[PDB]
Structure formats: structure tokens, C-alpha cells
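Supplementary Methods S3. Input chains for the assembly prediction are listed below.
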Amino acid sequence: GQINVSFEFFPPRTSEMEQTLWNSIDRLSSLKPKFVSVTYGANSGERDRTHSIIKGIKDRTGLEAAPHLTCIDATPDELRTIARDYWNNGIRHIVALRGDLEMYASDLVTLLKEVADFDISVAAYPEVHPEAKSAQADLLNLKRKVDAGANRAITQFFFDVESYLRFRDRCVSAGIDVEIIPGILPVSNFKQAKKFADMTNVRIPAWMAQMFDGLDDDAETRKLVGANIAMDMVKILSREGVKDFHFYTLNRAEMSYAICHTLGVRP
Amino acid sequence: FHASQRDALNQSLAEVQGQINVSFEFFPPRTSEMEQTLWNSIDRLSSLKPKFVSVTYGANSGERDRTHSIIKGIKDRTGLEAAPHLTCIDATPDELRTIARDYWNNGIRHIVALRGDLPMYASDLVTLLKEVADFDISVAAYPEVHPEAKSAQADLLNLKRKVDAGANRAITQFFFDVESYLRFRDRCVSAGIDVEIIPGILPVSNFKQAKKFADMTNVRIPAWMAQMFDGLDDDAETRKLVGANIAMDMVKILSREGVKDFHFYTLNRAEMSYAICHTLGVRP
Ligand SMILES: Cc1cc2nc3c(=O)[nH]c(=O)nc-3n(C[C@H](O)[C@H](O)[C@H](O)COP(=O)(O)OP(=O)(O)OC[C@H]3O[C@@H](n4cnc5c(N)ncnc54)[C@H](O)[C@@H]3O)c2cc1C
Ligand SMILES: Cc1cc2nc3c(=O)[nH]c(=O)nc-3n(C[C@H](O)[C@H](O)[C@H](O)COP(=O)(O)OP(=O)(O)OC[C@H]3O[C@@H](n4cnc5c(N)ncnc54)[C@H](O)[C@@H]3O)c2cc1C
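Predicted C-alpha cells for the full assembly:
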């Protein structure tokens, strides 16, 4: 396999979503992802739920599972205790984040590397983090995280492919040598995606807004239309040298599974 | 540079909204189950206000009763121009004229003139229909050349012959190699055929069945397509997404080339064709 993939899941908050997640884990695990990750939500499950899912994935599939760890409302001593626990129990890859609120993500990267030789992934923003002083400052921050020890950068989702491409070029110009892995968000629920995008400054091309117009009560068409968009995107990215994709599955597997299939990533 | 072109294609497609005509082809159901499925599809697709819809007729089946009834049932249920397919198999000239005149006197003014897969040619059928009355006549076109045809050129002159006889528009056999259809369209105008070569689109959800249809109609399945469906025999969900993707990409390219008319072989299913139409701006 020339292309590597990873899948992102979130801690289920209901019995129904819990069932869906494990079904998705089994489906996607067959594609042998390089790793999978589980997000964290301070008021939507906490660290224990994130850790529980991580442990469950590891026990059930043997896959490398990376918890997303944030450093807000958490003290350095707490983070070191947590990191040590994770390492001693087989968790060797962490997605180091600041989280939405003193410490910035680069501070956490440093703290983690002091504890152990963790594989570390950090967030990158092709369209600039909402709170950044400027695009230049945000790029310098990414370089700071990479220089602190980050092994790879995973981007916020995007729908304007050129935005990702230009960003990758600026990263290279800035001397950031790790892979800038595009985070792909397959869209089946446009209203939810639009809310996500508006809150993260991610641009939704006019042709895309037009493409989902009128489908609020048509889930089947939304899925076909969304899969087409995602398949076209990864095709172009692949043609531009991208060999790694991180999928925001939202705990569902059909779309990401099919997209991987078109990339030659099969069981 | 690859990214820019994509955004351009997608935007031009978004701007086509409200300028593309579409037609849907259906076949007579053989079970109570397919009967319900058909009418559910008709109700759903009718909301897209197609230029017209058509119903196939099994050549040498004698079930011409089912086809005609469905046609009337569609016209009386939706009010859409329902065009029945007519063949030259198991029918005499005097017999055909009877059907033609029977249709015209029942509201049916559009007919798809076909010879029919053998168990008197289409051109002879159009000429015959023309004299009986002034129906709109749609004939079959083959981008990859009809199996029986002795040559590509001979097959082409035949279509012209059918057009010259009074055929309004030609509808192509489904195809998956866009470049083949484009080369054929160029040959059609270069050969003096003045009607549009309407692409017949076959959205694929069942590759096995499609591969079969292709081996019976002499339609080529590109290597990239076989590769795209490889390993999905027991994955209907993935096949549908992959098939919808291929179909959406095809019409997007065709639309940019100037095609404003599409004919969908629905196989009595609405989901895929409905979605493909959506991307073309054809919506309720
Ligand atoms: C792949 C990915 C996964 C994510 N997973 C989660 C998750 O599970 N849970 C969750 O809560 N959030 C998650 N997030 C969201 C993330 O936590 C927010 O975007 C958060 O606001 C910033 O986190 P960060 O790690 O990018 O922080 P940082 O890299 O620290 O950046 C945050 C802001 O601070 C700025 N900055 C950095 N250093 C300085 C400085 N010295 N002075 C001033 N400004 C500075 C940056 O330019 C930027 O504007 C994820 C994001 C991505 C792209
Ligand atoms: C849109 C579409 C809808 C269809 N619907 C149906 C349907 O409802 N029912 C059904 O039974 N079938 C249907 N068919 C299939 C069709 O009937 C078969 O392909 C059949 O073989 C006859 O094709 P035709 O109408 O193109 O006949 P023709 O146009 O007569 O051509 C058929 C062959 O005869 C050759 N030819 C023509 N005239 C001569 C001549 N004078 N000398 C030598 N060679 C000649 C041509 O080159 C060609 O190979 C459909 C096909 C399409 C593309």
C-alpha cells in the first residue's frame, strides 16, 4: 500500500452511538489504518471516556490507537502523571492539543517528550486558527510544535483543496519537514458540517453550498453527493503527492470506507 | 493546476441548474415487488419534471400489453410525456401501423423506434411511423458500434439513414468510456447527422449485472472501472457510492462538453438517477 490512512472517532454519549462506533471500528479496522484516534470533550465525556474507547480499540483490534490529549484545566503535574500511565500501558502515540479554553500546544509537546519518546501528532490549520495573531504567526506556531518534537501535523478539515496545497507549500518554505496530513471530513449532514465550518473559519465553496441546497430532508442524496465530493478531493490530493489521509468519521464507516476503496486502500 | 480545473468544472456545473433536459427509462415489472418499486420511483422521479420518460418492450415477448398499459398509467398518473418503445420483432407492417395509429389516438405522440434484439430495420420503422403520423421519433445510437454492424462507418451511416427517415433524436447505448462517446459525437456531425446524440447513462450499483449487459451489447468496461469495482461483490453499500461517483463524474464532464440532454437507464430504481440529476441542477 502506497497510501496510509487513519480514522478519527469520538466518545459515544448514548447506547445507540456506542453500537454504531464499534460497528465502524470493525469495518474500518479491516483496512489496516496506520493508526486511529479518539477525540476529547471536556463537557462531552472527559478523559476517562476517551481513554476507555482507546483501550477498547486496542484490546479488540490490536491497532495503534491515539488519544487526543488537551492541556486546559489540566496542570503540568497532572499531564505528566497521565502521560506516564498511558505509556506504561501501551499508548505510544498521542495527538497533542491545547483545546478551546496558560499552556499552548507546544508546551504539551515538550512535556510529553520529557516523559517518553511518544509519537506525537499536532493540529495544523490551512485557513489559519481563528485566534491566531496572523497567518504568519500561526505557521510559526506550527513550526514551534514540530521543533518541540511533533512527528506529524494533521490539518483541520477543508473544502477548498487549493487552500491545503498552498498551505503545504508554505510549511515546506518554513522548513517544516514532517508530513502535513490532510484531515478529510466526508459530508453526509451538511447542516452539521456548515456549523463546524462557520465555527472554524473553514471556507465552503459556493458550488458545494449549492450542491447541498434543497437536500435537508434527503439523507440518501446527501450521502451520494457527499461521497462524490470527498472522492474527487482525495483523488486530486493523491495526484498532488499526498500519501496520507486522516478521516473525520464522526463514528460512521460507510463513507470513509468507500473513499479509501477509491484510493486503493482495501482489505 | 489540477485543483483549479476541478473548482471550475464544479462551478460551471452549479450554473447549469435549470437548463438540462432529462429522460428516464423504465421496464415492465415481472413481480408484485418490482411493481411497487416502479411506481415509487415514478412518483419520485416525476417531481424532477423530465422532458419525457419511456418504457421498454421485450422483443419477441408478445407482452406488448404490459408496456402500453404502463405508458397510459404513467401519463394518467403524472401527466408526463410517456414514450413507449416499439420493435420490429414479431410484427407485420400492417400490424405495426395499427399500433402506431392506436398510440397516436391515445395521446402517445413520442415513440422510441427500434428493430429489437432478434429472438425490416429501424429505419424502415421510422419511415413507416412517419407516414402514419407525425410522432416525435427517438432511435438508438451506438458509440462503440452495434454488434451486428459490419463496420464502424457502416453502423454510422445507418443512424443517418434513421435520422433522415424522420428520427428527431438519437439515444446512445450506455457507455463508460467518455472519450469514446465524444469521438462518436464528432463523427456524427462530421457525417452530417443534425440531431443530438443523447447519452444514455447507466448508473451502476450492481457491477456483475452491468458487466453482463456490456458483454451482450459490445460495450467496453474500462480497466480503471473493473479495478474500481474489484472486491465489492458483497459490499452493496460501497458499490452504490462508487457507482454514483463514476456517474456524477461522467455527466459533469459531458455537461462541460456541451451536453444538455441525458437519458437514464434507471432499471426502475430512483435513488441513483435522482442524485445524479440533482448534481446537474435538475431538482424538485
Ligand atoms: C486534527 C485536530 C484534532 C483536534 N482534536 C480535538 C479534540 O479531541 N478535542 C478538543 O478539545 N479540541 C480538538 N481540536 C481543536 C483544537 O483543540 C482547537 O483548535 C484549539 O483552539 C487549539 O489547539 P491547538 O492544539 O491547535 O493549539 P495551539 O497550536 O496552541 O494553537 C492555538 C492558538 O494559539 C496560538 N498561539 C500559539 N502559541 C502562541 C503564543 N505563544 N502566543 C500567542 N498565540 C499563540 C496559535 O497561533 C493559535 O491561534 C483538534 C484540531 C485538529 C486540527
Ligand atoms: C435507447 C435504447 C433503447 C432500447 N430499447 C429496447 C427495447 O425497449 N426493446 C428491445 O427489444 N430492445 C431495445 N433496445 C435494443 C435494440 O433493439 C437492439 O440493439 C437491436 O439489435 C436493434 O437495434 P436498432 O434499433 O439499433 O436497429 P437498427 O438501427 O436497424 O440497427 C441494427 C443493426 O443492423 C445494421 N444495419 C441496419 N440496416 C442495415 C442494412 N440495410 N444492411 C446491413 N446492416 C444494416 C446496423 O449497422 C446494426 O448493426 C434499445 C437500445 C437502445 C440503445
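The pocket of flavin-adenine dinucleotide (ligand 1) is lined by residues A 39-40, 68, 70, 95, 97-100, 104-105, 123, 129, 131-132, 137-138, 141, 145, 154, 156, 183 (CB under 6 Å). The beta strands of chain A are 4-9, 35-38, 65-70, 93-97, 119-124, 152-155, 180-181, 183-184, 244-248.
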